[model samples]
Target: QNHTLILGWSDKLGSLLNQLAIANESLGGGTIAVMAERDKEDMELDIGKMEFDFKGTSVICRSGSPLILADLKKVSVSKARTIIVLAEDGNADQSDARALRTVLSLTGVKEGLRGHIVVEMSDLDNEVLVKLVGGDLVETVVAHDVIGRLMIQCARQPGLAQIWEDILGFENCEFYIKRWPQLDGMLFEDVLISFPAAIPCGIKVASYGGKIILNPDDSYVLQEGDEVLVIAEDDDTYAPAPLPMVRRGSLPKDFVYPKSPERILFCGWRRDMEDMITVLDASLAPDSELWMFNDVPEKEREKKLIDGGLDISRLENISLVNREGNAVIRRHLESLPLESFDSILILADESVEDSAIQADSRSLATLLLIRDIQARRLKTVIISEILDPRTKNLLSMSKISDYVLSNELVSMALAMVAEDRQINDVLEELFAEEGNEMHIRQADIYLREGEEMSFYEIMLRARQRREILIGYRLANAERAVINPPAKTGRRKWSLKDVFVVITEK
Candidate 1:
């Protein structure tokens, strides 16, 4: 009755199933049932190529239309503990329509179904429709907006994309919320260090809205009815570490993080282009500049957002500049004053009307061209948005700080919610414009250039400032280690190293 159920199918299914399998390892393994319109054999074959040892879980596939009531009952929807609704690979509007129909039929059969549901949508505008029809058990993931926001977030702060990858997938640490009754009288600060294996980022309170409190004061006590929110390899890994857990260090005083407007170069187009720009504008100070290099003709470039469907206005914080050029062409990209920009963003473009293959080839080609001009602006962060993860997995390169995969995040969200429904609270809030987000900041801002300290002390300093320290990057390494092992966290700070943490500025 507690088995995982997936409805519909897409290019994301393999990646989705793989995450579910790895997450289930902690659950002692279970069944994952897939119900789609495609041949069961074909789905099975593709999933097998994932080459994942499912621990003890087995995937069972069936052929059926989830939009049909009989088919919905055939899979025992009411008995399932977790359900994920996948959007088809077609026109975005058409896929959303099908998802709506599937949900309508699902609710029609089991009015009181007992499971968490994650509905994946293509367009952000159609999210409201899903909200209207879906019940409290439903969570909608709009791929376009989330991908775009991640692009901007990672672009603004390099090395952040890997941190997200570390926390989201089951291969590493995942979020967990457990009410530890034994520690009812402890302080939040002690609770933080008590977990020898797991990392305590926050403690859940008794209330909603303010329910999931993160990075609370060290003095805040853990009272009755409080649930601890943490990230760990498994539920069984929460063991207490020896305290004098930290020898308190003096928190930096009168220090304010550096702030200034950013000069960003944006290339190509996306469905969420306006949202990206709007978010970029709000994030930066009034003097920031954004240069968009697209293939749009001069006539269309003039007042394009006003004339077309995009209605979001420029907030005047970030001055928007439009340039006519093909991002994949060497001549076009070299012509720009590339050295002036702090970061360059390459958005996936669609050719053949809308094609993932055609879109990725152009984006990859554009990245190669920019790196070849490797000649210029080598320090600038180059972030690309790719549709398929295979492209990122096969076409490897360096210094492009991040490659924001379209389907990977959505698939991760589905797998996460499926395993622990409450983790959705963290996932839902993580991508939104509000709350504390993970940012990569200079290590010198947090510690003296050569000071050696344990991660427990790092957390202590972060606690003083109300920021939860997640991980750090070595001065010489390109990769960032997230949720470092307890022993490994003890180290000397380097001048060029960066600290990855959740901050609001």
Candidate 2:
């Protein structure tokens, strides 16, 4: 068991760490210990409620100040296999810089600590400082980007937030990159014919550029590109994707908006709940329906659903329903007849347990309910929202529709800003209410059997519709497998990795 160490108490830090622990369980095993300035009971209560319970893990709460080196040593930084630095103090940068200096000052820590040093930086600009202290031993996880990028993504593409669920988690499709030496120097079209099971999404040029071109054209030649990024369900689809042949086009046009209306089901009661709902409401089609379920009192919830500025009465389809107990309850959730909705939106209730275990438990509970309803052939799409991305892969394995990470979204936002561009205008249109929406529509919707185009060509399709397409998820091979034993075909397994997820109105 690898020894893991964590510092801080923010709900975001806890949820993100818990998610990593839960995901590791599926992959293998590890030991984690957290140090925070809280009573043992409160810590347990907080971590215990997470969807991914960090049960077998050990946690130590040290009341000592995070700024002082001596107090920080109470948690034993030397023997840790991994050290996570979280922004425990309101002053995010000060705490982080102090923590780094403190770690560097610690005795027996300079060389003995070979484990990865992962930090959550609210101020990304300080990344260089964190790296200097930790060196190659450090990896940074920025929690804010999840929400920031999510907000921006929604702003860019309205209903698209739902399709994001299917691509972010374990069950959610993922981008698998590998060097296909077999069909090097071949045409994209030939590769497609060879690997019918897995759709070719893009090409990765291994040159100095490390350029990963998405959905390359059939006529495009596969040169000595360093790495190729392909979207597939799992490793099984790896061999099926032809090395040389692949999809050509930047992003497909069909992913652009004004498609069919969506009935969205949002569950949970949180500080951001109102804001998220408001943003979603103001950004979607007038015909879009929102069913808000809350554990809190119905009267209080109704009042908060819309910012007092907007009249809820005029919006005929947006309804706020009161569900008894927390959303974790089967009876309470089932009572809503979830099968009626086209998609499910889950917001991690800030008021509930914040650890991975507790959060995932609630999510798992919801998954069970959805599973029962789906068995009867219901069209309900699940869009579970999570604060932690570590749990994303596990939730993906659960194969319960799709899930999104508020933190990851925020990370994407950070990535955008890292590029130093004005994303506000783009974001506004992406999440705008009256414009065309963002989606991962049917590939067949935009592409025909005989036609072949480049990834840029596909992006042009969206441009034709006055929409912008960012990236796509390969839904072709959306299936699950128990890897070691080679268990195959449990559900509607997919090997097709070419479903486009757009980002504009």
Candidate 3:
């Protein structure tokens, strides 16, 4: 039978596999078959208990590793539609090496299999090597690096993790490419206003090597053989509006663009700390100050950061303090002017070798301390790097604006890439340093106090500023709603609500 095949199974992979199974049935119209190196009884037990529809999916358990040719041959790998190879848990180098070898083995099949291959690589340096060895048969994903970039973005803008999760996670509004030749000559802004249910984000042109242009110029016209990328509740929910009319906005008399320098505080340390810092430095406004609280020596930290390509001239100041003990951290938290900082980031200790849960445990303790301090001082935006999803709900009570679950975000990204390999390039470009990216801005820029206006009106106003207004966040809410239905009721803007948009900044 032609089905989706999973090469390895773990707690993380199992969850993604269950979601993919549901997605396959609904969108791809196929069943799922998993091949793991465990007994049939245990494998069935694990896959059965998952909180999804597994009735149409099957599992084939065998001995040893699934990389063995005998194990691979037992399943219909040659006939499968998609093959996902999860990196085995162990040493990073070893896991990457094993995954590359497994990809090579699959490429040497007798029939020259035609299924799409997706591999997870632990190390970023080996991505090029994996691509060269696997050729067109595979797409490699470096999970941690992508998660690090996403965490950095979330840190720059508060409440951004929810918007990303909604885009990447299968449980919420999803992205799809649809062909509509009826509106071939329509403008990009017209396409946005014409879709009643779906939110048009970009256009995909297959003639240009399946290139995706997100938030193109408003004057850009939809040409033939172009596919519109949109966000919808389901594939069947897209419908064109009977009457498409662009709304006009009347600028308020007292309009102002709020811009301010920032003060940032960092807690804990990790291997990816340098990368996160580099990204943050570029994102912050000039004359901003940064404070690092970690156990590393100042000289070493400065050297590593500089060697990692950080430009010291752009920042007003970079202060480093030793975080030797909990008492030291507590004293710093008590004495430091916490109210002056714009944002505080708690990094997960990835240096720990024993377990991810251990790293998350230390992060949890640090979070409790921060919560205690925030109770007395002015509220500052706080973002934490967490490894376990189970601990997220527990820490949500702390009122942290956002939590970046690196492992879970990576898993969700991998699942999305496995479903459509082209998403890799789209996400990479979206997260890159020099490209148009999503940002959260003050909503009052477009809507005045107590102004009840439709989202179409907001979109028209944002076009004047060369930005696309996709969604918005409420004042006291933790999550943001992206790509809301066009016919939804008009919104009364509050001072605290922010507009989420795609901008070059």
Candidate 4:
């Protein structure tokens, strides 16, 4: 009766299952039943193609349409503990229609509302409909807004993508919201020190309409019904360590992170082009310029932009320009001043290609052309979008290339929401137009070079500055270390290294 049910299908199944398996390992794994239109054997064979080792987890696939009440019964939907519904395509209107229809079928009918439901919609307009249908029980996720905010945020800060991969992923550390009534009178500062093993992220006040205060002031007292968010290996692992010996000395104060005007270029186009522009515009520094190169007929593209309610002329921080050319061809790509850009984005282009394979290949070609022009000494942050995670390795040949897997991201978000609904607002605030977000800055900004200090002391110094120092980046290592043990990481901190922190604008 507590089985997990996933409705519908897409390429995201592999990543979703992989994450679910990792998360389930803590509880000795569990059963997952999937209901889709494809034959049961076909779905099974497709999952086998990914060569996934489920460990103790078992997956059951049943062939049927999710729209039918009879078919929905085959999955034991009413007895499930968690239900995840996925959209099959990228078309916002069409995808949202099926998602909303299936959501209504699940919520409207009394038979399907027995579990925690998480529905994936492609557009922002249908968000309200999803909530009204399921009320407080159902949560909505949009891939466009998720990817759009993340891609732009990643572009602005290097080494931030790997941080998110660790934070959202299940294998290493994950976000857990727990209420500690025993420590209800403690201040946020004491709460931070009480957990020597776990990293305190933020506090969620449920009574204040789910008010989330992240990297909160150290003096805010924790009251009853306040959910404290922490990142750790497992839910129980975050229990208080025996010795909570915290640092108390006043540390060096930090200056502001230097901001510089940047010129960015965007290659190719996707269905969420308008939102991408809107998000990028908000992320860019003032006086920055944005140049777009795509084969989308500008004459017709203008109407789509206006219809989407985007006024190009009124953009404040960045100046916008459009160029007509194909991104895949080197001859066309060479027409732009590629070397002048501070960052370049290669979006998953579906303008001319119908499939993700062709779209990724187009991005690969564009990246190669740009790399060739720069003589392989790349300085600009190159963020590429890959629709399918299987094709991600093709671009991995370029070391230091950051990729945003569209399907894998949505799958991870779904898994997170399905686990604990407390994090839904936490995730949105980090990626929304305003609020605190994860940032990476030079290690020297907080400490001197060769200064030896434990990770615990490093976090204490950051806390005084109203920042949550989750991890640190090494000069020689490619991966960043998030929430290293309090006592073990004492070593010579390098100026070349960077500290991954959570901060507001």
Among the numbered candidates, top lDDT falls to 4
By lDDT: ranked, best first: 4, 1, 3, 2
Candidate 3 backbone collisions, by pair: none
Highest TM-score: which candidate? 4
Q: For every model shown, what is its TM-score relative to the native structure?
A: 0.89, 0.48, 0.86, 0.92
| Candidate 2 residue-wise lDDT, 1-505, digit = tens | 3466666666554544444454345445556566666776777676666565664555555555544565556666666656666655455556567656644554235445545565556554576776677676665544442353354343333345545443333343444566777778787655544343343445666653664554455566777644454445654555744233333444333444454556677677654355455555544565767776777787666566454345556645454455555676666766676777766766666555345456666766666666676565444556565655656665555554554444444333222222212222233233334333345544555555445454434444544444333444445333221111211112221324233443334
Candidate 2 runs further than 4 Å off = 1-63, 67-261, 303-319, 323-326, 374-378, 386-447, 454-475, 479-505
Better structure of 1 and 3 per lDDT: 1
Off by over 4 Å in 1: 26-28, 48-51, 110-112, 207-210, 253-261, 301-304, 307-314, 350-355, 376-378, 396-406, 487-490
Candidate 1 lDDT tens digits, 35-119: 9989989988877777557888888888998888777777888888888998877777788898888777777764467786788
After superposing candidate 3 on the true structure, give the runs of residues whose Cα lies further than 4 Å from its correct spot: 9-11, 25-30, 33-56, 59-61, 64-66, 250-261, 295-322, 326-341, 352-354, 374-378, 394-406, 486-491
Estimate the overall C-alpha local distance difference test score of candidate 1: 0.76
How close to the true structure is residue 246 of candidate 2, measured as C-alpha lDDT? 31
Better of 3 and 4 by TM-score: 4
**Model 4 scores what on Cα lDDT?**
0.78
